[PDB]
Amino acid sequence: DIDNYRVKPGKRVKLSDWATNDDAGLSKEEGQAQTAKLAGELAEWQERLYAEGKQSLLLILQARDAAGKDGAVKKVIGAFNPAGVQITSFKQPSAEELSHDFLWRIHQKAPAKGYVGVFNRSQYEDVLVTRVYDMIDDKTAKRRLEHIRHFEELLTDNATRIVKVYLHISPEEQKERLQARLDNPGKHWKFNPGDLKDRSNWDKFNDVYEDALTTSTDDAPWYVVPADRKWYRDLVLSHILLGALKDMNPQFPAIDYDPSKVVIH
Amino acid sequence: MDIDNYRVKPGKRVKLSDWATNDDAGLSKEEGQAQTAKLAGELAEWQERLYAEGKQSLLLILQARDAAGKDGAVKKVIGAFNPAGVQITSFKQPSAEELSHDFLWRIHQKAPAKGYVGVFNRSQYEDVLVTRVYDMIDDKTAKRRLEHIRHFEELLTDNATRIVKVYLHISPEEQKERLQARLDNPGKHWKFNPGDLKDRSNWDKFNDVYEDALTTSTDDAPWYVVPADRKWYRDLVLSHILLGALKDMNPQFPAIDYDPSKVVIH
Ligand SMILES: Nc1ncnc2c1ncn2[C@@H]1O[C@H](COP(=O)(O)OP(=O)(O)OP(=O)(O)O)[C@@H](O)[C@H]1O
Ligand SMILES: Nc1ncnc2c1ncn2[C@@H]1O[C@H](COP(=O)(O)OP(=O)(O)OP(=O)(O)O)[C@@H](O)[C@H]1O
Ligand SMILES: Nc1ncnc2c1ncn2[C@@H]1O[C@H](COP(=O)(O)OP(=O)(O)OP(=O)(O)O)[C@@H](O)[C@H]1O
Ligand SMILES: Nc1ncnc2c1ncn2[C@@H]1O[C@H](COP(=O)(O)OP(=O)(O)OP(=O)(O)O)[C@@H](O)[C@H]1O
Ligand SMILES: [Cl-]
Ligand SMILES: [Mg+2]
Ligand SMILES: [Mg+2]
Ligand SMILES: [Mg+2]
Ligand SMILES: [Mg+2]
Incomplete structure (x- = not known):
């Protein structure tokens, strides 16, 4: 059921293979x-x-702008104890980052043992906006996707369980959400009209997102999450993470004392 | 029991016994929540x-000391903020690399960037708390470190980092009940170490060094003593402290370089 959102290994997909507004037959109240x-x-x-x-x-x-990355972090990652979470929001590379290979700044933020790491945007940006606007070409993108996969294989072998999630919203949903930023004076700061060129390139972004999903493997899957309904985005992501953690099955460690014997003065 | 009653006023002498550990401001748990x-x-x-x-x-x-509520305060109150705007650091025992630097080196690295809320779960004060109790530094070194801490806070203040220091104030009996609950619950044995009960036996030495630490309280960089025996009251008071700080900071939405009513989204 959740597995219907998993991009299966070894076959290309189209974003339109999935609806953007699933609810699994649930009411909003049931889902929440x-x-x-x-x-x-x-x-x-x-x-x-x-x-x-x-x-x-x-x-x-x-995910594209207004697709709910921020909300998903707030609602779902907010379920965890923040002391055991590391969130990184990857923005435009600095001059220092640009002077390194594209995974240098990404690898530095990989999570330590015992932690949940969250990447709001990620190494995939280096094969998304960079391709749409012709800063790299297909041969370079292919190389970078191979390096991404090798990086994910390295983390997997380190017992970092990788889950990649694409938040799948429709162009009309994006347009409503962007318009809501223009209409709310508390949200103008969040709206950049220069960013509207991305909408003109919607299908080109579909194209490169579809190539990014080709790194989906059994060990490091992509999920396409219908996110027009924010509550259903949160529900599906919660299942994805809970399924991962149950399969990892971490155990409380052995202790070196007998608790029944301990006397607290 | 009004919020400024919990502020440590600037001065040379601080006594934790001036505050109760179990205030409720006359509210029920449900009202406070x-x-x-x-x-x-x-x-x-x-x-x-x-x-x-x-x-x-x-x-x-x-x-604050063990089981005083640091973790719960971060969860409940810092959880109100958008996590994209929050940077939390839990300072643990210094690594060898940290120890090969001055004691503020690892602290300064974690100071927050403009636009952010930084949270230190433990802090530069650890270097004048446990280190004193167990005789790793003497009093003269502790006094010198307190001066460096104050200078460090002055530097951050001048960078428009608003500093709020919160001591969570619990009674020994409340701590005992909370530690017993870790023993009683098999899912909590992992965060109970009997070795740490030595710190309880040093409860008064810890009061003494905490009271010295609280003398860095200034108008610009205040300490608050938050009665934390009631976890809901801790969260309520902390929420008021942070909200009062933000309202005084009075951040404004920025000017924009476009007219929103003229943008046409296609
Ligand atoms: N490797 C990269 N190369 C170029 N641009 C990048 C890279 N990584 C991130 N970015 C860009 O940094 C910007 C971050 O912008 P910002 O923090 O304002 O959020 P945003 O514009 O809402 O992001 P998004 O469009 O993903 O919602 C995004 O446009 C993102 O595409
Ligand atoms: N500068 C420092 N020097 C020595 N010890 C430090 C320093 N900073 C932090 N520590 C110690 O690191 C330990 C962190 O241990 P841990 O994460 O298990 O939390 P804890 O024992 O519950 O901490 P606490 O007693 O503060 O609630 C604490 O005992 C703390 O005193
Ligand atoms: N669920 C959790 N996820 C991640 N880290 C945790 C979790 N629970 C505890 N820790 C870390 O384990 C250590 C011991 O936990 P503890 O419950 O004593 O929290 P604390 O932050 O020291 O708060 P308190 O003031 O209540 O002692 C702390 O370093 C805490 O950050
Ligand atoms: N309340 C906030 N506090 C801190 N950072 C914020 C806050 N709101 C937004 N941001 C950051 O500002 C940028 C733009 O916000 P936006 O609402 O587009 O978030 P986003 O993470 O890009 O999610 P989405 O997929 O919805 O676009 C992002 O870089 C986001 O991290
Ligand atoms: Cl010193
Ligand atoms: Mg965005
Ligand atoms: Mg943008
Ligand atoms: Mg503790
Ligand atoms: Mg301890």
Whole structure:
């Protein structure tokens, strides 16, 4: 069921293979209730992840503007204890970052053992906007996708469990959400009219997003998450993360004392 | 029990016994929780303005003993903020590399950027707390480190980092009940170490060194002593402290370079 959103290995896909506005037959109220119940489970499993200190989880969120990366971090990553989470929001590369290979700044933020890392935007930006606006060509993009895959294989072998999530919104949904930034004086700061050129290039972005999804493997899957309904985005992401953590199955560590014997004065 | 009653006024002498560990301001748990919920929305609005403005930052330092509520305060109150605007650092025992530098080197690295709320779960004060109790530094070195801490805070203040230091004030009996609950719950044994009960036996030495630390309280960089036996009351008071700081900072949404009513989205 959630697995219907997993990009299966070894076959290219089209973003239009998935609807942008699924609800799995649930009411918003039912979905939000389930999300709240999942939050408690996410917290217990993340506490076990940290206590164990042998494994880590890396969620990569990659999506167009207004698709809900920020909201998903707030609502779903907010279920975890913030002491066991590292969030990085990757913005335009600095001069220093540009003077290195494109994974230098990405690798530095990979999570330590016991932690959940979150990448709001990621190494995939280096094969997304860069291709649409012709800063790299297809041969370079192919090389970078291979290097991305090798990087993910390296983290997997380090017991970093990788989950990549594409938040799938329709162009009309994006347009409503952007218009809502223009209409709210508290949100103008968040709206850049120069960014509207990206909408003119919507299909070109589909094209390069579809190539990014080709790094989906059994060990490092991409999920296409219908995100027009923000509550359903949060519900599906909660299941994805909880499924990952249950499969990682981190255990509380052995202790070197007998608790029944301890006397607190 | 009004919020400025919890501020450590500037001066040379601080006594933790001046504050109770279990204030409730006359509120029930349900009333206080309702008020904390209302304040969360205001915290989120002001932190968005802080970020959008990009001129100032907020640095909350939480410094308290085990089971006093640092973790829970970060979860409940710092959780009101958009996490994209928050940078949390939990300072643990210094690594060999950290120890080969001055004691503020690893602290300064984590100071917040403009637009951000930084949270230190433990802080530069650790270097004049546990290190004193167990005789790794003497008093003369502790006094010199307190001076360097004050200078460091003055530097951040002059960079428009608003510094708020919070001591979570719990009673020994409340701490005992909370530590017993870790023992009683198999899912919490991993964060109970019997070795740490030595710190409880040094409760008064820790009072002494905390009271010295609290003398860095200034009008620009205040300490607050937050009665934290009631976890809901801790969260309520902390929410008010942070909200009062943000409102005084008064971050403004920035001027924009376009007219919104003329933009036509296609
Ligand atoms: N490797 C990269 N190369 C070029 N641009 C990048 C790279 N990584 C991130 N960026 C850009 O940095 C910008 C960050 O902008 P900002 O923080 O304002 O959020 P945003 O514009 O809302 O981002 P998004 O369009 O993903 O929602 C995004 O446009 C993103 O595409
Ligand atoms: N500068 C420092 N020098 C020595 N020890 C430090 C320093 N900074 C932090 N520590 C110690 O690192 C330890 C962190 O241990 P841990 O993450 O297990 O949390 P904890 O034991 O619950 O901390 P706390 O007693 O503050 O609640 C704390 O005991 C703290 O005192
Ligand atoms: N669920 C969790 N996820 C990630 N880290 C955690 C979690 N629970 C505890 N920790 C870390 O483990 C250490 C011991 O936890 P503890 O419950 O003592 O929290 P704390 O931050 O020291 O707060 P307190 O003031 O209540 O002691 C702390 O370093 C804390 O950050
Ligand atoms: N309240 C906030 N506090 C801190 N940073 C914020 C806040 N709101 C937005 N940002 C940052 O500003 C930028 C633009 O915000 P935006 O709402 O587009 O978020 P986003 O993460 O790009 O998510 P989306 O997929 O919805 O575009 C992002 O870089 C985001 O991290
Ligand atoms: Cl010194
Ligand atoms: Mg955006
Ligand atoms: Mg943009
Ligand atoms: Mg503790
Ligand atoms: Mg301890």
